[PDB]
Design a binder for these strands. Structure first.
Ligand SMILES: [Zn+2]
Length: 376
RNA sequence: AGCACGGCUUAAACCGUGC
């Protein structure tokens, strides 16, 4: 019933576990949100995604805009209906495509005009349009339109991009409030930029706080500066942001990264790793990452992870999946990904449990320990 | 093709190293 209602229920240091209440469902936090870029979480049926424990999936604007197209999905009944996921969905503004598809992109002030990475055509993605697109889709959590600042970057672009991104953060807000159908049902998040310079991360925070958002996300990180630098930034960045609103670290997601970011104060995560690595052949277990393609697993009858409760681990051997993935079989990508996502969820679960038991810091250290041991 | 590995923080059921 409530549009957006963040409510922290426990804390331990800069970390905290809570719940986000939206019209489409409840979101347990800290939470990990699987990435279903083009209206699908690679190799997984919506129900399976839910089966693993995800309360919310993330969809991308840039891609959806091009295919199957904003207006078309809308004409079909909204993304949710289109793909078969009735729980909340968070759509990215496409600010990531501005820095990864930068190749075929031309920046300005009105927005970012780029060429279809497959079609070749031309599209002008503006703060206005991005928010319109996200409205058409029917996304529950709308992300402002930003520009993920590449790394490394001189204090020049570091500020240009940032400042321009804020100007855009305002245009989004306005756009988001222009339609009451969207302002009454969805939520809006703002993205903090400024690379690794704090005096800049400060400005961005303030600019964002002035405008007013339902949730604040730290972006521009995990863009290749190593865990070290990132944590170093999160150390002063997350604190600049409004404490009574959720904090969302975009793109980050690697067991140890997530665990650390939580200690730093993050509430939400979204990342390609689990779903991409599944497809490729890498599985995430309590004993570190393992590449199921290795010769060793050829006759290994144990499951990907003996602690995992996932449906895969309850029924298939390493050797079976070894065989499949290695042979190009699709069932492999299905089992791998289902495992990895279920895993990230179980991880998010355990973190939450610990935070509301005041034993998270203990959890974290026990985690890295066994995680880096790799006695699997 | 294949074998032994490695990376991935959606232009990746993909790429890269060695034989
Ligand atoms: Zn599993």
């Amino acid at each position: 019933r409530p549009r957006f209602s963040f409510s922290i229920a426990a804390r331990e240091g800069k970390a905290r576990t809570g719940t986000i209440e939206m019209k489409r469902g409840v979101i347990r936090t800290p939470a990990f949100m699987p990435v279903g870029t083009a209206a699908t979480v690679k190799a997984l049926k919506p129900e399976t995604v839910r089966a693993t424990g995800a309360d919310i999936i993330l969809g991308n604007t840039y891609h959806l805009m091009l295919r199957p197209g904003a207006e078309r999905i809308a004409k079909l009944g909204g993304l949710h209906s289109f793909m078969g996921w009735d729980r909340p969905i968070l759509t990215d503004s496409g600010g990531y495509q501005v820095m990864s598809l930068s190749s075929l992109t031309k920046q300005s002030e009105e927005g970012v005009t780029f060429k279809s990475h497959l079609d070749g055509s031309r599209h002008m993605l503006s703060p206005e349009r991005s928010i319109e697109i996200q409205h058409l889709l029917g996304s529950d959590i709308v992300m402002a339109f930003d520009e993920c600042t590449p790394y490394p970057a001189t204090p020049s672009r570091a500020a240009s991009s940032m400042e321009r991104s804020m100007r855009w953060a305002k245009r989004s807000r306005d756009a988001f409030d222009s339609r009451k159908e969207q302002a009454e049902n969805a939520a809006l998040f703002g993205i903090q930029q400024g690379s690794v310079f704090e005096n800049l991360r400060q400005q961005s925070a303030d600019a964002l706080a002035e405008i007013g958002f339902d949730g604040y996300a730290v972006g521009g990180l995990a863009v290749g500066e190593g865990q070290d630098e990132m944590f170093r930034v999160l150390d002063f960045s997350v604190p600049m942001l409004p404490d009574d609103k959720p904090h969302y670290l975009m793109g980050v997601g690697k067991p140890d990264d997530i665990v650390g970011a939580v200690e730093r104060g993050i509430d939400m995560f979204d990342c390609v790793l689990p779903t991409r690595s599944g497809r490729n052949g890498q599985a995430f277990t309590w004993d570190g990452p393992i590449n199921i393609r290795n010769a060793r697993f050829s006759e290994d009858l144990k499951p990907l992870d003996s602690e995992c409760h996932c449906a895969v681990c309850q029924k298939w051997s390493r050797a079976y999946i070894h065989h499949l993935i290695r042979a190009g079989e699709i069932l492999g990508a299905m089992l791998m990904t289902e495992h990895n996502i279920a895993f990230y969820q179980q991880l998010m679960q355990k973190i939450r449990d610990s935070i509301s038991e005041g034993r998270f810091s203990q959890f974290a250290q026990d985690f890295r320990a066994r995680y880096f041991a790799r006695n699997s």
